[PDB]
Design an enzyme around this catalytic site. Structure first.
Site, PDB file in Angstrom:
ATOM      1  N   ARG B 177       0.839  -1.193   0.000  1.00  0.00           N
ATOM      2  CA  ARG B 177       0.000   0.000   0.000  1.00  0.00           C
ATOM      3  C   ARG B 177       0.875   1.245   0.000  1.00  0.00           C
ATOM      4  NH1 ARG B 177      -5.355  -1.572   3.678  1.00  0.00           N
ATOM      5  NH2 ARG B 177      -6.274   0.234   2.604  1.00  0.00           N
ATOM      6  N   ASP B 242      -0.222  -9.030  -4.691  1.00  0.00           N
ATOM      7  CA  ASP B 242      -1.172  -8.093  -5.286  1.00  0.00           C
ATOM      8  C   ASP B 242      -2.136  -8.794  -6.237  1.00  0.00           C
ATOM      9  OD1 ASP B 242       0.887  -8.734  -6.969  1.00  0.00           O
ATOM     10  OD2 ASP B 242       1.151  -6.725  -7.800  1.00  0.00           O
ATOM     11  N   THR B 243      -1.613  -9.663  -7.106  1.00  0.00           N
ATOM     12  CA  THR B 243      -2.474 -10.297  -8.101  1.00  0.00           C
ATOM     13  C   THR B 243      -3.461 -11.261  -7.459  1.00  0.00           C
ATOM     14  OG1 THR B 243      -0.906 -12.062  -8.462  1.00  0.00           O
ATOM     15  CG2 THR B 243      -0.678 -10.059  -9.792  1.00  0.00           C
ATOM     16  N   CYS B 348       4.250 -17.712 -14.621  1.00  0.00           N
ATOM     17  CA  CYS B 348       4.166 -17.581 -13.169  1.00  0.00           C
ATOM     18  C   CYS B 348       4.590 -18.859 -12.460  1.00  0.00           C
ATOM     19  CB  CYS B 348       2.737 -17.212 -12.762  1.00  0.00           C
ATOM     20  SG  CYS B 348       2.524 -16.971 -10.965  1.00  0.00           S
ATOM     21  N   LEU B 349       5.641 -18.761 -11.644  1.00  0.00           N
ATOM     22  CA  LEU B 349       6.061 -19.934 -10.889  1.00  0.00           C
ATOM     23  C   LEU B 349       5.119 -20.239  -9.730  1.00  0.00           C
ATOM     24  CD1 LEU B 349       7.558 -18.780  -8.079  1.00  0.00           C
ATOM     25  CD2 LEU B 349       9.342 -18.172  -9.751  1.00  0.00           C
ATOM     26  N   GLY B 350       4.199 -19.333  -9.408  1.00  0.00           N
ATOM     27  CA  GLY B 350       3.207 -19.603  -8.385  1.00  0.00           C
ATOM     28  C   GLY B 350       1.864 -20.064  -8.924  1.00  0.00           C
TER      29      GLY B 350
HETATM   30  C1  HEM Z   1      -4.172 -15.108  -9.594  1.00  0.00           C
HETATM   31  C2  HEM Z   1      -2.894 -15.243  -9.224  1.00  0.00           C
HETATM   32  C3  HEM Z   1      -1.662 -14.954 -10.128  1.00  0.00           C
HETATM   33  C4  HEM Z   1      -1.592 -14.492 -11.394  1.00  0.00           C
HETATM   34  C5  HEM Z   1      -2.755 -14.099 -12.335  1.00  0.00           C
HETATM   35  C6  HEM Z   1      -0.191 -14.403 -11.778  1.00  0.00           C
HETATM   36  C7  HEM Z   1       0.303 -13.965 -13.003  1.00  0.00           C
HETATM   37  C8  HEM Z   1       1.664 -13.828 -13.281  1.00  0.00           C
HETATM   38  C9  HEM Z   1       2.236 -13.334 -14.519  1.00  0.00           C
HETATM   39  C10 HEM Z   1       1.445 -12.850 -15.751  1.00  0.00           C
HETATM   40  C11 HEM Z   1       3.569 -13.364 -14.411  1.00  0.00           C
HETATM   41  C12 HEM Z   1       4.579 -12.939 -15.493  1.00  0.00           C
HETATM   42  C13 HEM Z   1       4.781 -14.147 -16.402  1.00  0.00           C
HETATM   43  C14 HEM Z   1       5.795 -13.817 -17.462  1.00  0.00           C
HETATM   44  O1  HEM Z   1       6.525 -12.806 -17.273  1.00  0.00           O
HETATM   45  O2  HEM Z   1       5.868 -14.569 -18.476  1.00  0.00           O
HETATM   46  C15 HEM Z   1       3.931 -13.886 -13.111  1.00  0.00           C
HETATM   47  C16 HEM Z   1       5.230 -14.095 -12.643  1.00  0.00           C
HETATM   48  C17 HEM Z   1       5.534 -14.422 -11.319  1.00  0.00           C
HETATM   49  N1  HEM Z   1       4.659 -14.848 -10.318  1.00  0.00           N
HETATM   50 FE1  HEM Z   1       2.578 -14.734 -10.453  1.00  0.00          FE
HETATM   51  N2  HEM Z   1       0.563 -14.826 -10.692  1.00  0.00           N
HETATM   52  C18 HEM Z   1      -0.308 -15.181  -9.670  1.00  0.00           C
HETATM   53  C19 HEM Z   1       0.016 -15.663  -8.411  1.00  0.00           C
HETATM   54  C20 HEM Z   1       1.296 -15.819  -7.900  1.00  0.00           C
HETATM   55  C21 HEM Z   1       1.614 -16.452  -6.635  1.00  0.00           C
HETATM   56  C22 HEM Z   1       0.580 -17.050  -5.648  1.00  0.00           C
HETATM   57  C23 HEM Z   1       2.941 -16.429  -6.464  1.00  0.00           C
HETATM   58  C24 HEM Z   1       3.626 -17.024  -5.210  1.00  0.00           C
HETATM   59  C25 HEM Z   1       4.952 -17.060  -5.066  1.00  0.00           C
HETATM   60  C26 HEM Z   1       3.541 -15.772  -7.631  1.00  0.00           C
HETATM   61  C27 HEM Z   1       4.884 -15.527  -7.901  1.00  0.00           C
HETATM   62  C28 HEM Z   1       5.371 -15.078  -9.136  1.00  0.00           C
HETATM   63  C29 HEM Z   1       6.760 -14.781  -9.439  1.00  0.00           C
HETATM   64  C30 HEM Z   1       7.936 -14.894  -8.440  1.00  0.00           C
HETATM   65  C31 HEM Z   1       6.856 -14.396 -10.723  1.00  0.00           C
HETATM   66  C32 HEM Z   1       8.147 -13.991 -11.471  1.00  0.00           C
HETATM   67  C33 HEM Z   1       8.556 -15.147 -12.394  1.00  0.00           C
HETATM   68  C34 HEM Z   1       9.853 -14.887 -13.133  1.00  0.00           C
HETATM   69  O3  HEM Z   1      10.226 -13.696 -13.313  1.00  0.00           O
HETATM   70  O4  HEM Z   1      10.519 -15.880 -13.542  1.00  0.00           O
HETATM   71  N3  HEM Z   1       2.496 -15.424  -8.480  1.00  0.00           N
HETATM   72  N4  HEM Z   1       2.735 -14.151 -12.448  1.00  0.00           N
HETATM   73  C1  LIG Z   2       4.885  -6.185 -11.270  1.00  0.00           C
HETATM   74  C2  LIG Z   2       5.090  -7.166 -10.173  1.00  0.00           C
HETATM   75  C3  LIG Z   2       5.909  -6.576  -9.086  1.00  0.00           C
HETATM   76  C4  LIG Z   2       3.786  -7.708  -9.667  1.00  0.00           C
HETATM   77  C5  LIG Z   2       4.313  -8.739  -8.716  1.00  0.00           C
HETATM   78  C6  LIG Z   2       5.507  -9.314  -9.425  1.00  0.00           C
HETATM   79  C7  LIG Z   2       5.600  -8.486 -10.674  1.00  0.00           C
HETATM   80  C8  LIG Z   2       6.900  -8.541 -11.393  1.00  0.00           C
HETATM   81  C9  LIG Z   2       4.439  -8.899 -11.494  1.00  0.00           C
HETATM   82  O1  LIG Z   2       4.498  -9.564 -12.725  1.00  0.00           O
HETATM   83  C10 LIG Z   2       3.198  -8.468 -10.799  1.00  0.00           C
HETATM   84  C1  LIG Z   3       2.679 -12.788  -9.946  1.00  0.00           C
HETATM   85  N1  LIG Z   3       2.320 -11.838  -9.384  1.00  0.00           N
END
Ligand code: HEM
Ligand SMILES: CC1(C)[C@@H]2CC[C@@]1(C)C(=O)C2
Ligand SMILES: [C-]#N
Ligand SMILES: *[C@H]1CC(=O)N(CCCCCCN2C(=O)CCC2=O)C1=O
Ligand code: FES
Ligand SMILES: [Ca+2]
Lengths: 106, 405
Positions: B177, B242-243, B348-350
């Site tokens: 925030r 946030d997402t 997304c690794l999550g």
């Molecule tokens: C509704 C839930 C979520 C959505 C829609 C979402 C969506 C995304 C998207 C679009 C990206 C970028 C993918 C890309 O750059 O090709 C991303 C990356 C990432 N997400 Fe999420 N995400 C979600 C939940 C989470 C959760 C629960 C975690 C828990 C650790 C997480 C951790 C990350 C991280 C660390 C990255 C960076 C990956 C990288 O740079 O290699 N996300 N996510």
């Molecule tokens: C812009 C962000 C900081 C936000 C959380 C991780 C990030 C890289 C995303 O793809 C969503």
């Molecule tokens: C992924 N936030």
């Protein structure tokens, strides 16, 4: 349709896979932790590496350019029957296919 | 403020679109982005806003760009205006060798095997929080569930005790925030200094919690440093925050206004996994992009090296060429197509943890509060950006219609 995943230790995992689902998605969705699928199935990570049984190799569609250049990165032994199981889409023609899962994807 | 048109961008490709303030925002942020997909809009447009950049509007171009390692970078040039959303806990100057090793380590912490083992406890966490709100007949779902739920899930993963809940909640609140007199670095450093004693402690005698796995990881044949370990933990805590918060609010906002969709899931709970995937398509919320690493003619458009190109993950699933009647929410939708978690090597690794949090949330909420609606006279406001979101979600229900389970 039915797919059998043979882990490195000889453990068998016989699994019913829906038509249109990749061998990665089925494995990941059904506790087959020895298949990772880090990139989500777009031939971008090589963490879905599997060895295709020689009975089904000529039946499954062949690998494209992206899959082969990605297969060079597998951490386990790269064999001529190595495939990215996210590129192997399940059809009824492939009923009974067996895949050997390497000891590592990372 | 509108940037000058680069000499290689033809005039007919110029489109008025500010990704931080789209014109039709009051209809909903997804609908506001869908103006990019109206019948007369090119597949690849250029906007003067936010320094000038390309926007690909169709799933086909979005998927191909994220896959094309030749001409498109792997890192995003779009800096979020908020300081907290712009920080990369793992530096952008990293090479593919290190990128793979960090994905591997993060996979040990939040991969599918870990999510399966923790599902029963994620279930208990969702129940405990929902049952705590059930007799009140009112709540701000964003503040009262959407925000505490994933924070508490990180504490389960990381083996953190429950008496640290108010402190860790307060610290993540200072980071996410922008309100509050404290810079992000000060809040981030305050987060680090909470992790460092637990990191240094569990490096000697570890366990199998998330912090122990990270603290005992190996990078380049040597132990992971304390700096790398705290960055990993910070990324795993605030990365998804946030997402997840905003997507849950998008989903619950829709279910609050859709009694027939609620009854469909109440009567047939076996459809909640499919319904969650259809909500992930319909209420997709990430809109990021890449930068050109060399000149390239992409679908008949001349792109130059250094051009920023927005590749909105959310637009792939809203594309009528991918999903017919894309604004219709059909839990029985045949071939759900989206790129809501992204596409390519950085997906997304999550994703597995996120899907489980959504499925458990809908399951445990509809069992206890099967019928609810928006508070009367409330004005739900959406926000647009790299991560779009819901400002607040005031919900009300009749406690006598609820069932304690
Ligand atoms: C509704 C839930 C979520 C959505 C829609 C979402 C969506 C995304 C998207 C679009 C990206 C970028 C993918 C890309 O750059 O090709 C991303 C990356 C990432 N997400 Fe999420 N995400 C979600 C939940 C989470 C959760 C629960 C975690 C828990 C650790 C997480 C951790 C990350 C991280 C660390 C990255 C960076 C990956 C990288 O740079 O290699 N996300 N996510
Ligand atoms: C812009 C962000 C900081 C936000 C959380 C991780 C990030 C890289 C995303 O793809 C969503
Ligand atoms: C992924 N936030
Ligand atoms: C899943 C979603 C989709 O659009 N699709 C391709 C459409 C034809 C596939 C449907 C018929 N079918 C099956 O049901 C199994 C194999 C097959 O071709 C998908 O596959
Ligand atoms: S899942 Fe990434 S290549 Fe098969
Ligand atoms: Ca300090």
């Amino acid at each position: 349709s039915k797919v059998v995943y043979v882990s490195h230790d000889g453990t068998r995992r016989e699994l019913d896979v829906a038509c249109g689902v990749s061998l990665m998605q089925a494995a990941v969705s059904n506790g087959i932790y020895d298949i990772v699928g880090d990139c989500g199935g777009s031939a971008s990570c090589a963490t879905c590496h599997v060895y295709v049984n020689e009975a089904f190799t000529d039946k499954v569609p062949a690998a494209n350019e992206r899959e082969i250049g990605m297969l060079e990165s597998v951490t386990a032994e790269l064999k001529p029957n190595s495939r990215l199981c996210c590129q192997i889409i399940m059809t009824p023609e492939l009923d009974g296919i067996v895949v050997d899962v390497p000891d590592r994807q990372w | 403020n509108l940037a000058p048109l680069p000499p290689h961008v033809p005039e007919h490709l110029v489109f008025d679109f500010d990704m931080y303030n789209p014109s039709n925002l009051s209809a909903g942020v997804q609908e506001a982005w869908a103006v990019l997909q109206e019948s007369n809009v090119p597949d690849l447009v250029w906007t003067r806003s936010n320094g000038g950049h390309w926007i690909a509007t169709r799933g086909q171009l979005i998927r191909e760009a994220y896959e094309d390692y030749r001409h498109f970078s792997s890192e995003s040039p779009f800096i979020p205006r908020e300081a907290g959303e712009a920080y990369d806990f793992i530096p952008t100057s990293m090479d593919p060798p290190e990128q793979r090793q960090f994905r591997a380590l993060a996979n040990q912490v939040v991969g599918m095997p870990v999510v399966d083992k923790l599902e029963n406890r994620i279930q208990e966490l969702a129940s405990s929080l929902i049952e705590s709100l059930r007799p009140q007949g009112q709540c701000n779902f964003t503040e009262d569930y959407a925000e505490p739920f994933p924070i508490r899930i990180f504490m389960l993963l990381a083996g953190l005790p429950e008496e640290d809940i108010p402190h860790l909640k307060y610290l993540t609140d200072q980071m996410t925030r922008p309100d509050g007199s404290m810079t992000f670095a000060e809040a981030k450093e305050a987060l680090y200094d909470y992790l460092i004693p637990i990191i240094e402690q569990r490096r000697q005698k570890p366990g199998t919690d998330a912090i122990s796995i990270v603290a005992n990881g190996q990078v380049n044949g040597r132990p992971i440093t304390s700096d790398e370990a705290k960055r990993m933990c910070g990324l795993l805590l605030v990365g998804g925050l946030d997402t997840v918060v905003n997507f849950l609010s998008f989903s619950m906002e829709f279910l609050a206004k859709s009694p027939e969709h609620r009854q469909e899931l109440i009567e047939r709970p076996e459809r909640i996994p499919a319904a969650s995937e259809e909500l992930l398509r319909r209420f997709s919320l990430v809109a990021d992009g890449r930068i050109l690493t060399s000149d390239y003619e992409f679908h008949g458009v001349q792109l130059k090296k250094g051009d920023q190109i927005l590749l909105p993950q959310m637009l792939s699933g809203l594309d009528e060429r991918e999903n017919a009647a894309p604004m219709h929410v059909d839990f029985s939708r045949q071939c759900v197509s989206h790129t809501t978690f992204g596409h390519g090597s950085h997906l997304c690794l999550g994703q597995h943890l996120a899907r489980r949090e959504i499925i458990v949330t809908l399951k445990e909420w509809l069992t206890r509060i099967p019928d609810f609606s928006i508070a009367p006279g409330a004005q739900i406001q959406h926000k647009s950006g790299i991560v779009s979101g819901v400002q607040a979600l005031p919900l009300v229900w009749d406690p006598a219609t609820t069932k304690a389970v």
